[PDB]
Amino acid sequence: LDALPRVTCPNHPDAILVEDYRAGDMICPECGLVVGDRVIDVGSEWRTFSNDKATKDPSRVGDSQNPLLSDGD
Amino acid sequence: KPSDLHLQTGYKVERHMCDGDIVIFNRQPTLHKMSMMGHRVRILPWST
Amino acid sequence: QPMIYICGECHTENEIKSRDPIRCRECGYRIMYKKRTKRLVVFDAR
Amino acid sequence: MIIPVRCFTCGKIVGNKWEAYLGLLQAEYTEGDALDALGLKRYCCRRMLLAHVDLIEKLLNYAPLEK
Amino acid sequence: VYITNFHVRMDTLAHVLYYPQKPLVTTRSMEYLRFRELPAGINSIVAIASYTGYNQEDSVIMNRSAVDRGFFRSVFYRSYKEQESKKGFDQEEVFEKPTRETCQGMRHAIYDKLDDDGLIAPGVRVSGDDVIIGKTVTLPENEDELESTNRRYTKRDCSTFLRTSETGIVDQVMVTLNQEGYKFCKIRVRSVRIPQIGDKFASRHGQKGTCGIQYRQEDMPFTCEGITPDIIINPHAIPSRMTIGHLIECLQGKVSANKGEIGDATPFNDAVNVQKISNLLSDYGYHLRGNEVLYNGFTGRKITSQIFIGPTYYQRLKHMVDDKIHSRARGPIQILNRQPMEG
Amino acid sequence: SLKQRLKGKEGRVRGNLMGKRVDFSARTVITPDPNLSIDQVGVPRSIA
Amino acid sequence: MNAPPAFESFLLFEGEKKITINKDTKVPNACLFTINKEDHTLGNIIKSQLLKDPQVLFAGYKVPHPLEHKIIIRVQTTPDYSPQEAFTNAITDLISELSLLEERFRVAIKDKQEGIE
Amino acid sequence: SNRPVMGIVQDTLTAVRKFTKRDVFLERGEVMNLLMFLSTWDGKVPQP
Amino acid sequence: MPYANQPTVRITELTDENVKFIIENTDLAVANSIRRVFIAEVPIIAIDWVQIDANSSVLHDEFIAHRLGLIPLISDDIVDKLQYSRDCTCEEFCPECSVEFTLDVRCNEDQTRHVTSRDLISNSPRVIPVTSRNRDNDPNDYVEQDDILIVKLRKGQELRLRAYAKKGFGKEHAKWNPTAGVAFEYDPDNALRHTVYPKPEEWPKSEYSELDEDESQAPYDPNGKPERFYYNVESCGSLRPETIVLSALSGLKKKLSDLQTQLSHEIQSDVLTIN
Ligand SMILES: [Zn+2]
Ligand SMILES: [Zn+2]
Ligand SMILES: [Zn+2]
Ligand SMILES: [Zn+2]
């Protein structure tokens, strides 16, 4: 079970799958069989995605932490 | 086809919370024993 | 859509199809106003 | 701020009496006289007209009022 | 209300009143503090009565027909802002209007209420699902190649969606730039607020009370001519907290209403507010103690007790009952400990 | 570090074992209603 | 709006009914009526018409909840006189009484086109 | 403390001592109205 | 039923804004039920649907639309013939019920212009609008004859909006209330002794106790009966006072006749017989 791009259904090959925000489920249009295993939500983690800092505060916190570069002086 | 769904015996339906359900009604914060008792639901308008 | 913002000083519209940085003629400030939505909106009198 | 029509207690009109109450005070400086000639008799109607300020005169004094 | 210019200010928490009526029984000390010009409520007639026993423990009973006429009708003014800042060297935000196929990451919402520029126009029935500010950003660019163009490429949907709680309408749209040098936007959401059952209220004497229940005008008692009360307070709420001053405003407001003069409420006067004020009320054609009898609104039987009626100035707290609710069956779950979100 | 996440200073003890969040719950504003029974609790329509 | 609309308080639905005929399972020969979408405006006049009639032994009315709109009527009469005729003769006496009140009301208002004095 | 926690005070306390007052005499039309308000009732009107 | 109480109507004084009458020989439940009909029962026509096309004044649209429906629209043109919108099964709105109300005003001068209810025209046929210099043909008004003022428009403010006039009554919303307040009083001497009146000397005499001038300080009467009910219906200006009673007595019998028809329908559907 590794060929899971973004759509999959055990009964028929899925094609489209929406991402509901009011419920956080993978509702399928042509049937409705969800895929299960809900991780973090895209809408709930909007402000914590990509630019998950306090307005431009890179310094990349991985090894050589240096809060400067851009907008940090 | 919501009006044409094949269902048999042994399934689980997540319907609404109808009347006659015994639910717990605590206080938060709790100070003594009789502060986490149960009650029966009753549908009524307004968020009260 | 002719609705391309409204100046806040001279109170004049621009009505141009471009991606200018909210620039306007004569007046050079950044106080931008916007028109009303042209759509059948149903209100109430209660 | 624009007194409404029909009081919240009874229902007698009073919204159209603010323009006439300000004119009676210029020629007659008496609160007990202008409130009687306007048909107001009960205490529920006197509360809506007396306890009401007209702040709309200070809002219309602005100049940027066209867009 | 707190100022005069209400169209130039765009604050996240702003509440105004439709009819800011000045209080009747007021003091001369607040005349210099600019209080009679900017009040916080109206002079609602509060009749001390038991009614049906629904105004128990910091709660009152109001009229449903009075709210329909304009009883404490406020407007919820909330302003939002989204800074259009950079995202790297060649990464930045672009205000545009993508489609369903030329972009990815639109959860489930569509762009049916947006504009070509990337914003919303004043007068659109926005809800808890639509997008108020639409914007996209890219990151891979040169990384995603080798027959990977199609139509969306790397267009990530980073639009600003409204929280599933605000069901208002856009009123004002302002676009300007700050000292940061970035062209941002600032819109305001206009919502209708009505005193529904459950909202938190207060009083000028300190006896706060939420909206217990609201009945019609026919279901409420009335006097002789037809004076229907607006707010019913618990009579037992006075001896439980020794709030004697609440009965002073309820009696002083009745005398000033029959006379037509702003009576002074100086707490250190020599006019004797016990016998002189009581004797003046009996001259107009009422009881000197201010007690009146009402009639039953269901059967028509005379009330045995005497309801002490009179106007009393109240206020309105900022505690929305529909905003403090929180309920969910099954939604987003975190990944750190497999637990729900914050709130 | 690794010890602070388990010591108790808002780690895996106080912030999870002694203070987490559950599902299926409601918290509004209570209102008096003596006409109801001793077990008939109020249930709003929006919550239901 | 979280609460019901303004028209739901009086307008019925396609699956709801007005008056409901139900019999009692306690005292012999009795019926417990049930009228939907109605407040205390109508329930107060039904008891008054049955109380004056000496052929009625018991008559009362209550509501399950004051915020809702539903009234019930439990009448108990003699074992010879059917309780269904007591409520039927009571609704006909009220209409005949209000009809005569309107007829006499139109005569008094039309007997003074100029003035009584 | 071997004592019940249910308390009946405030509005549900003054009307109790006033209903049993010596200066209280109900009429005939008010008795049948209160009998129907009972949740349960055998159906036996008491003797006046 | 054999024996029954007969009505007794004696009109005291009727005017244009209020009416006074006395009802005798009736039950106490009838006196309280007749007051609930004179308020929220009579069908009144008023503005319901509101649409704002263009607005550039100092007030928002949610404040003008609230004051538009509160205007006491007159109903002296037989409003019972209008069919409800929920029973017309047409296309939302139709000229048979919804009356088109259009507004168009523009202030180009420097001084402030007062916008009243006269600028609100109507594309509907010749139907009487609101009481604002149109019905009172007799030169005997107040001082200018007005009911409500929209907003004080200054130099550079326009106002264009559309609205319809649907059908409703007081039970649906408080804006369809043709009567302001209804007075009620019976037996000023307190014969039934429903209350106590502590020290009757402090209690003043009302305007209805003049016919029974008693000096015995509230006389007692054991064999009492609710007789002689006073009334003073005061309208707010939406309908003629003596006409509201005529339109309420006919509408009250229609509600009672519907229950009588529904009662016979349940008997035919059930296995119980009455004949
Ligand atoms: Zn599928
Ligand atoms: Zn410009
Ligand atoms: Zn009034
Ligand atoms: Zn129609």
Side-chain angles (χ1 to χ4, degrees):
Chain A
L1 191 65
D2 291 330
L4 278 76
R6 63 180 293 165
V7 290
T8 179
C9 290
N11 54 4
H12 67 278
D14 195 0
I16 197 66
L17 183 62
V18 298
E19 294 179 353
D20 186 74
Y21 181 74
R22 293 182 291 113
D25 291 331
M26 290 296 174
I27 298 97
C28 190
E30 66 268 16
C31 67
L33 277 77
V34 302
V35 298
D37 292 331
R38 169 60 64 191
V39 289
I40 58 170
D41 195 1
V42 178
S44 296
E45 298 291 327
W46 177 68
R47 61 181 60 86
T48 61
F49 182 75
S50 179
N51 193 0
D52 55 355
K53 305 297 186 291
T55 308
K56 290 182 180 180
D57 187 74
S59 97
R60 57 142 107 196
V61 282
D63 194 1
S64 296
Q65 293 178 355
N66 191 1
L68 196 63
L69 278 75
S70 36
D71 205 32
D73 193 1
Chain B
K1 46 182 181 180
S3 296
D4 186 74
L5 183 63
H6 187 273
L7 57 94
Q8 295 295 321
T9 300
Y11 291 166
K12 291 177 71 68
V13 177
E14 293 181 353
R15 65 178 177 87
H16 293 88
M17 183 178 71
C18 295
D19 291 331
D21 291 331
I22 301 299
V23 300
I24 192 166
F25 180 71
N26 54 3
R27 179 180 174 182
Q28 184 178 2
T30 301
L31 293 175
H32 58 90
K33 181 176 174 65
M34 283 72 172
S35 295
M36 291 181 70
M37 295 181 286
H39 295 285
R40 187 177 66 189
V41 297
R42 181 66 178 171
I43 300 300
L44 50 91
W46 284 279
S47 296
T48 61
Chain C
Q1 184 62 255
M3 182 179 68
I4 314 295
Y5 293 100
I6 298 168
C7 184
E9 289 82 8
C10 65
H11 297 89
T12 60
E13 68 271 15
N14 197 357
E15 295 179 353
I16 60 168
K17 297 296 289 183
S18 67
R19 294 290 185 268
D20 53 351
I22 58 171
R23 295 292 299 273
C24 182
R25 54 184 181 272
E26 50 264 13
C27 182
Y29 288 163
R30 300 293 184 269
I31 301 299
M32 293 296 107
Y33 189 72
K34 197 169 184 178
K35 285 283 186 68
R36 187 177 175 87
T37 301
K38 185 175 73 175
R39 183 66 66 192
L40 183 64
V41 177
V42 175
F43 292 99
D44 54 353
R46 294 182 184 271
Chain D
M1 290 297 291
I2 179 66
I3 178 166
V5 180
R6 297 181 67 189
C7 182
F8 292 161
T9 300
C10 64
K12 184 175 173 66
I13 59 170
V14 72
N16 55 3
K17 299 293 183 182
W18 186 258
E19 291 85 4
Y21 182 75
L22 294 174
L24 294 174
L25 294 175
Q26 184 66 41
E28 182 68 28
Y29 292 98
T30 300
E31 291 85 4
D33 197 2
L35 292 174
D36 199 3
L38 294 175
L40 278 75
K41 301 294 187 291
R42 298 292 182 183
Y43 62 93
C44 63
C45 296
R46 303 290 180 89
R47 179 181 57 82
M48 186 64 72
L49 197 145
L50 182 64
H52 187 272
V53 69
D54 189 73
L55 195 64
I56 196 166
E57 292 293 327
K58 300 284 103 176
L59 185 62
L60 294 174
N61 202 4
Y62 292 162
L65 293 175
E66 63 184 1
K67 295 291 180 68
Chain E
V1 296
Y2 57 98
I3 53 174
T4 61
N5 44 1
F6 289 162
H7 65 279
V8 71
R9 296 289 187 268
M10 293 179 72
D11 191 75
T12 62
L13 294 175
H15 294 88
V16 299
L17 186 61
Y18 284 168
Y19 305 104
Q21 294 179 357
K22 63 182 181 180
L24 182 63
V25 180
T26 187
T27 64
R28 292 181 181 177
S29 66
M30 291 185 285
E31 185 178 1
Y32 301 102
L33 295 175
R34 297 292 184 269
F35 183 75
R36 64 183 180 179
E37 293 87 4
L38 294 170
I42 61 170
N43 289 316
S44 65
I45 296 171
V46 177
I48 294 95
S50 296
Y51 194 68
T52 60
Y54 291 163
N55 53 3
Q56 293 176 354
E57 188 67 28
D58 292 331
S59 62
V60 295
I61 299 168
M62 290 180 180
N63 192 0
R64 184 67 178 87
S65 296
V67 179
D68 291 331
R69 292 180 179 91
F71 185 75
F72 286 97
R73 284 182 179 268
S74 66
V75 177
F76 180 72
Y77 289 102
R78 186 174 179 178
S79 296
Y80 294 100
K81 63 181 178 67
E82 291 294 327
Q83 184 178 2
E84 186 182 3
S85 66
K86 298 291 288 185
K87 298 294 186 291
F89 184 74
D90 289 331
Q91 294 84 17
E92 65 183 1
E93 293 178 352
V94 174
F95 286 166
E96 64 184 1
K97 185 176 174 66
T99 62
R100 296 287 294 166
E101 291 85 4
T102 60
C103 182
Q104 64 183 358
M106 289 182 181
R107 50 185 68 87
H108 68 279
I110 63 171
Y111 288 166
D112 56 354
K113 300 294 187 291
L114 277 76
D115 197 74
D116 198 3
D117 58 355
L119 294 174
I120 192 166
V124 176
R125 297 290 185 183
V126 69
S127 296
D129 197 2
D130 291 331
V131 176
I132 50 171
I133 288 97
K135 64 182 178 67
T136 60
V137 70
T138 61
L139 292 174
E141 285 289 329
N142 201 4
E143 183 178 1
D144 184 73
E145 291 292 328
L146 271 299
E147 293 180 353
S148 296
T149 301
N150 191 0
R151 291 175 291 174
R152 58 177 175 86
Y153 195 71
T154 61
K155 188 182 288 185
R156 300 291 180 90
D157 185 74
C158 63
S159 66
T160 302
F161 63 95
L162 186 61
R163 187 180 67 189
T164 63
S165 65
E166 292 87 4
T167 60
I169 192 167
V170 178
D171 187 74
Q172 184 62 255
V173 174
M174 295 298 291
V175 176
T176 187
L177 55 93
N178 55 3
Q179 67 181 358
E180 298 291 327
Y182 297 101
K183 181 176 73 175
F184 65 94
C185 64
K186 186 181 263 77
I187 64 170
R188 188 177 67 246
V189 176
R190 184 179 67 189
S191 179
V192 177
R193 296 296 299 160
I194 50 98
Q196 62 184 356
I197 297 170
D199 195 76
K200 186 186 288 185
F201 288 157
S203 68
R204 198 175 74 186
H205 296 285
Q207 184 67 42
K208 60 182 177 180
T210 61
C211 183
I213 196 165
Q214 292 179 356
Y215 286 100
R216 291 184 290 113
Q217 186 177 2
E218 294 86 3
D219 292 331
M220 292 179 71
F222 59 93
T223 62
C224 182
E225 193 270 331
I227 303 299
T228 61
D230 291 331
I231 294 169
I232 298 169
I233 198 167
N234 193 1
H236 293 285
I238 299 299
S240 66
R241 293 180 181 177
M242 293 182 286
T243 307
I244 308 299
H246 180 74
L247 294 174
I248 298 170
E249 181 182 1
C250 189
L251 184 64
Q252 186 67 41
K254 184 178 179 180
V255 179
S256 296
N258 290 318
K259 185 177 180 180
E261 184 68 28
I262 303 299
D264 194 1
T266 299
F268 297 99
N269 54 3
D270 56 354
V272 183
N273 297 115
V274 175
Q275 186 67 41
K276 186 182 286 185
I277 303 299
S278 296
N279 197 2
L280 185 62
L281 185 62
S282 179
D283 198 3
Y284 294 99
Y286 295 100
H287 196 270
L288 52 94
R289 287 288 185 265
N291 290 318
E292 292 181 354
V293 63
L294 273 72
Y295 292 160
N296 193 1
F298 293 99
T299 61
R301 187 177 183 270
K302 294 182 181 180
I303 301 299
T304 301
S305 67
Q306 291 83 18
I307 294 96
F308 188 72
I309 198 167
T312 305
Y313 183 76
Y314 285 169
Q315 290 85 16
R316 181 178 178 180
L317 291 174
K318 186 178 72 68
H319 293 89
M320 295 182 287
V321 63
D322 56 354
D323 188 74
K324 293 182 183 292
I325 61 171
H326 189 193
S327 67
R328 191 188 72 188
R330 183 176 176 87
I333 304 298
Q334 294 179 356
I335 203 66
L336 185 64
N337 289 316
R338 194 174 175 87
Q339 290 182 355
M341 295 297 291
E342 186 69 27
Chain F
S1 296
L2 193 144
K3 184 176 74 175
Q4 187 177 2
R5 293 179 181 177
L6 200 138
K7 181 69 172 66
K9 189 179 289 293
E10 286 89 7
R12 295 290 185 270
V13 176
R14 182 177 291 172
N16 294 115
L17 294 174
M18 296 296 173
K20 64 186 289 184
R21 291 181 179 90
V22 301
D23 289 329
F24 295 98
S25 181
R27 186 176 178 88
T28 67
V29 175
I30 58 169
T31 54
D33 194 359
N35 207 166
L36 294 175
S37 178
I38 48 93
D39 57 354
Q40 292 178 356
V41 73
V43 172
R45 292 179 64 88
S46 66
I47 305 299
Chain G
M1 186 179 288
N2 195 2
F7 61 91
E8 198 268 332
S9 66
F10 57 90
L11 183 62
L12 279 78
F13 293 99
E14 69 271 15
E16 292 180 353
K17 66 187 289 184
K18 293 181 181 179
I19 190 166
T20 302
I21 302 299
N22 289 319
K23 293 186 286 185
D24 195 1
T25 61
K26 183 67 173 66
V27 293
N29 195 1
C31 294
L32 193 146
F33 292 163
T34 299
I35 295 95
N36 194 0
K37 297 292 180 68
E38 186 67 29
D39 55 354
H40 295 285
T41 306
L42 185 62
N44 56 4
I45 199 64
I46 302 300
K47 184 179 183 293
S48 296
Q49 295 294 321
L50 294 174
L51 185 63
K52 186 169 71 175
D53 194 1
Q55 293 180 356
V56 177
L57 277 76
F58 182 75
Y61 64 95
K62 73 174 182 180
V63 293
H65 197 273
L67 187 62
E68 293 179 353
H69 295 89
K70 185 182 286 185
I71 59 169
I72 58 171
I73 296 169
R74 183 178 182 271
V75 62
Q76 183 178 2
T77 61
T78 62
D80 195 2
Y81 186 76
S82 66
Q84 292 84 17
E85 292 179 354
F87 182 75
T88 301
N89 200 3
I91 197 167
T92 58
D93 198 3
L94 183 62
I95 296 170
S96 296
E97 184 178 1
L98 293 174
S99 296
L100 186 62
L101 193 144
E102 185 178 1
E103 292 179 353
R104 292 180 181 177
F105 181 76
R106 294 181 184 271
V107 178
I109 63 170
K110 291 182 183 293
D111 203 1
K112 48 183 182 294
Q113 291 84 17
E114 184 177 1
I116 50 95
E117 182 68 28
Chain H
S1 66
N2 59 16
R3 286 180 181 177
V5 75
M6 180 178 174
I8 303 299
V9 293
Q10 197 174 5
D11 289 332
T12 57
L13 185 63
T14 303
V16 174
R17 68 179 296 277
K18 191 175 181 180
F19 184 75
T20 62
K21 190 175 174 66
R22 301 291 293 164
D23 295 331
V24 175
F25 291 99
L26 278 76
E27 64 183 1
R28 191 259 181 87
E30 292 292 328
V31 173
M32 292 181 183
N33 196 2
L34 296 176
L35 290 173
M36 190 65 205
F37 288 163
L38 296 174
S39 296
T40 181
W41 183 54
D42 56 354
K44 183 178 184 292
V45 177
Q47 185 173 0
Chain I
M1 188 174 179
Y3 65 95
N5 297 115
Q6 61 182 357
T8 299
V9 177
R10 296 187 298 171
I11 303 299
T12 300
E13 183 179 1
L14 56 94
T15 59
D16 188 74
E17 65 183 1
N18 54 3
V19 66
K20 185 182 286 185
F21 59 93
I22 299 169
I23 303 299
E24 292 182 352
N25 194 1
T26 188
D27 197 0
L28 184 63
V30 180
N32 206 167
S33 66
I34 198 66
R35 186 178 182 271
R36 299 173 68 92
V37 179
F38 289 163
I39 302 298
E41 184 67 28
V42 176
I44 304 299
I45 302 299
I47 294 96
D48 195 1
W49 180 68
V50 174
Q51 182 183 3
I52 294 95
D53 195 1
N55 192 1
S56 66
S57 66
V58 299
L59 295 173
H60 55 88
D61 292 331
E62 293 179 353
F63 182 74
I64 300 170
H66 181 73
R67 294 178 66 250
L68 184 61
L70 193 63
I71 299 169
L73 186 63
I74 201 67
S75 296
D76 195 1
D77 198 73
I78 305 169
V79 299
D80 200 4
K81 65 182 181 180
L82 277 77
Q83 188 177 2
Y84 293 99
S85 179
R86 65 185 183 273
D87 292 331
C88 191
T89 183
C90 65
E91 186 178 1
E92 184 67 28
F93 61 93
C94 65
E96 293 293 328
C97 68
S98 296
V99 178
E100 183 177 0
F101 282 161
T102 60
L103 193 144
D104 193 0
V105 66
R106 184 176 179 179
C107 182
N108 290 318
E109 64 270 16
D110 186 74
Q111 67 271 16
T112 301
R113 186 259 183 88
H114 295 285
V115 176
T116 61
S117 66
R118 294 179 293 172
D119 291 331
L120 182 63
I121 61 170
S122 66
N123 207 166
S124 295
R126 290 180 177 90
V127 178
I128 175 167
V130 76
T131 304
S132 179
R133 191 177 292 171
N134 54 3
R135 182 179 63 84
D136 290 331
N137 55 3
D138 194 1
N140 195 0
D141 54 355
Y142 290 163
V143 71
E144 191 67 28
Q145 188 177 2
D146 54 354
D147 55 354
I148 189 167
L149 194 145
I150 306 299
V151 65
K152 293 181 181 180
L153 294 174
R154 65 182 294 275
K155 184 177 180 180
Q157 290 182 356
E158 294 179 354
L159 183 63
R160 290 188 296 272
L161 56 93
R162 293 175 63 88
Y164 286 167
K166 292 182 181 180
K167 185 176 180 180
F169 43 87
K171 188 180 289 293
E172 182 179 1
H173 194 271
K175 67 183 179 180
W176 290 292
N177 193 0
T179 302
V182 175
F184 185 73
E185 183 68 27
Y186 63 97
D187 190 74
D189 291 331
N190 194 2
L192 294 174
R193 294 291 184 183
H194 290 171
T195 177
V196 177
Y197 280 109
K199 188 176 185 292
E201 184 178 1
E202 294 179 354
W203 292 95
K205 292 181 181 179
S206 66
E207 66 183 1
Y208 295 101
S209 66
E210 186 178 1
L211 295 174
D212 291 331
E213 182 68 28
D214 186 75
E215 294 293 328
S216 66
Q217 297 294 321
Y220 182 76
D221 186 74
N223 289 318
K225 186 182 286 186
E227 188 67 27
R228 187 177 295 113
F229 294 95
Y230 295 101
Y231 291 98
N232 192 359
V233 174
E234 183 178 1
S235 179
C236 65
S238 296
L239 192 58
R240 196 172 181 88
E242 62 268 19
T243 307
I244 298 169
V245 179
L246 293 173
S247 296
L249 293 174
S250 296
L252 183 61
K253 293 189 288 185
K254 293 182 183 293
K255 186 176 180 180
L256 294 174
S257 296
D258 197 2
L259 184 63
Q260 185 178 2
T261 303
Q262 186 62 255
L263 181 63
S264 296
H265 191 195
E266 294 292 328
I267 301 299
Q268 294 179 356
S269 296
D270 199 359
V271 296
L272 294 176
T273 63
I274 201 162
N275 195 0

mmCIF file of all heavy atoms in Angstrom, chain B residues 12 14 16-17 22 46:
data_model
loop_
_atom_site.group_PDB
_atom_site.id
_atom_site.type_symbol
_atom_site.label_atom_id
_atom_site.label_comp_id
_atom_site.label_asym_id
_atom_site.label_seq_id
_atom_site.Cartn_x
_atom_site.Cartn_y
_atom_site.Cartn_z
ATOM 1 N N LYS B 12 -23.094 1.259 11.788
ATOM 2 C CA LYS B 12 -23.117 2.325 12.781
ATOM 3 C C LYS B 12 -23.493 3.631 12.100
ATOM 4 O O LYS B 12 -22.861 4.024 11.115
ATOM 5 C CB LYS B 12 -21.760 2.460 13.481
ATOM 6 C CG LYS B 12 -21.407 1.289 14.383
ATOM 7 C CD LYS B 12 -20.018 1.449 14.979
ATOM 8 C CE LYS B 12 -19.984 2.563 16.010
ATOM 9 N NZ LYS B 12 -20.780 2.223 17.222
ATOM 10 N N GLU B 14 -24.116 7.730 12.672
ATOM 11 C CA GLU B 14 -23.845 8.877 13.541
ATOM 12 C C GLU B 14 -24.929 9.924 13.309
ATOM 13 O O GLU B 14 -24.747 10.919 12.603
ATOM 14 C CB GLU B 14 -22.451 9.433 13.278
ATOM 15 C CG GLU B 14 -21.323 8.500 13.685
ATOM 16 C CD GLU B 14 -19.953 9.098 13.432
ATOM 17 O OE1 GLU B 14 -19.881 10.186 12.824
ATOM 18 O OE2 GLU B 14 -18.948 8.479 13.841
ATOM 19 N N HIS B 16 -28.134 12.583 14.809
ATOM 20 C CA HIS B 16 -28.160 13.718 15.715
ATOM 21 C C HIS B 16 -28.456 13.258 17.141
ATOM 22 O O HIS B 16 -28.803 12.103 17.395
ATOM 23 C CB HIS B 16 -29.200 14.743 15.260
ATOM 24 C CG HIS B 16 -28.867 15.406 13.960
ATOM 25 N ND1 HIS B 16 -29.237 14.881 12.741
ATOM 26 C CD2 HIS B 16 -28.202 16.554 13.688
ATOM 27 C CE1 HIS B 16 -28.813 15.675 11.774
ATOM 28 N NE2 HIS B 16 -28.182 16.697 12.323
ATOM 29 N N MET B 17 -28.311 14.190 18.082
ATOM 30 C CA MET B 17 -28.568 13.918 19.496
ATOM 31 C C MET B 17 -30.032 14.224 19.778
ATOM 32 O O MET B 17 -30.410 15.359 20.074
ATOM 33 C CB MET B 17 -27.637 14.735 20.381
ATOM 34 C CG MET B 17 -27.795 14.464 21.868
ATOM 35 S SD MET B 17 -26.638 15.411 22.875
ATOM 36 C CE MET B 17 -27.306 17.063 22.695
ATOM 37 N N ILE B 22 -29.002 10.630 28.209
ATOM 38 C CA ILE B 22 -28.452 11.007 29.507
ATOM 39 C C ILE B 22 -27.008 11.447 29.296
ATOM 40 O O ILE B 22 -26.138 10.629 28.986
ATOM 41 C CB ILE B 22 -28.542 9.854 30.513
ATOM 42 C CG1 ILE B 22 -29.997 9.419 30.697
ATOM 43 C CG2 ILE B 22 -27.932 10.262 31.845
ATOM 44 C CD1 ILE B 22 -30.897 10.510 31.236
ATOM 45 N N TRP B 46 -31.878 29.193 21.082
ATOM 46 C CA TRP B 46 -30.883 30.051 21.725
ATOM 47 C C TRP B 46 -29.758 29.241 22.362
ATOM 48 O O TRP B 46 -29.964 28.109 22.810
ATOM 49 C CB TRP B 46 -31.534 30.966 22.769
ATOM 50 C CG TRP B 46 -32.291 32.115 22.176
ATOM 51 C CD1 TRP B 46 -31.771 33.294 21.726
ATOM 52 C CD2 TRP B 46 -33.708 32.202 21.980
ATOM 53 N NE1 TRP B 46 -32.774 34.105 21.255
ATOM 54 C CE2 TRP B 46 -33.974 33.459 21.401
ATOM 55 C CE3 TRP B 46 -34.777 31.338 22.236
ATOM 56 C CZ2 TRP B 46 -35.263 33.873 21.073
ATOM 57 C CZ3 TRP B 46 -36.057 31.752 21.909
ATOM 58 C CH2 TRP B 46 -36.288 33.006 21.334
#
